[model samples]
Target: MTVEQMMKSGEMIRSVCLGKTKVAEELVNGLRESKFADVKELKCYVNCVMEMMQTMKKGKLNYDASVKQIDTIMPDELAGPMRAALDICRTVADGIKNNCDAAYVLLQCLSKNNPKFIFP
Candidate 1:
């Protein structure tokens, strides 16, 4: 379901998380220019939006820890979608962990190097 519909249905936290997914590319672009060591930069972003947040560790997402925070934050129907959004984020972050390359391809890979830039 669309984020707008989800919000109307009372999925407040999840819809917000989903909204982040909708703007994923915009967010990633900003991260690219942050100039911090890649993973630390991502950590900074994650911490900004979450209390006791745990997004990654040792080059991989600490999924077990991440899920618990989401559970505590919402603990309702919204949890599922929020978790889904986190999973999607983990995939992109994995690319960062492994270094941005074929393994970490863009989410919208439609000629990313084209005139205006692109994503997987």
Candidate 2:
């Protein structure tokens, strides 16, 4: 899928996750700016998105699954940078005890590493 398609899908997933978590929109407002909130609601919202994206498993970020999904959904031009960013951020989950925190931290790393990273 192209970036537009991914964004559309992300918005769809975002609505569902928002409904599920009842998270405040303001808390995750920085998502578009590649910023992450350490609050529980925000973290859970990130986890919710990852879960819906199928990039997370067992409360952990699954590299293989994420790569596969990225390949399936993103164009090579986009996927390449994202994959490289993910490679570097893969360890961000390491030593993290909470699933939501791990997902939030992973996003932080990815956003920092890849300037084009986006969140709906």
Q: List the candidates' TM-scores in order.
A: 0.36, 0.89
For candidate 1, give the lDDT of residue 50: 37
User: How many clashing pairs per prediction, in order?
Assistant: 6, 1
lDDT by residue (tens digit), candidate 1, 18-120: 3553434345455334322334333333333232244334445567886786565443565666566555555554546442231223212212322222111
Please, what are the lDDT tens digits per residue for candidate 2 over residues 6-105?
7787779889999988999887778878657567888999899888778886568888989998877777877888899999998888888788888888
Cα lDDT listed for each candidate: 0.41, 0.82
Model 1 residue pairs with clashes? 106-120, 107-120, 108-119, 108-120, 109-119, 109-120
lDDT of 1 at 103: 23
> What's the true lDDT of residue 119 in model 1?
13
- Worst 10-residue lDDT window for candidate 1 reads 111-120
After superposition, the stretches of candidate 2 with alpha carbons farther than 4 Å from their true spots are: none
lDDT of 2: 0.82
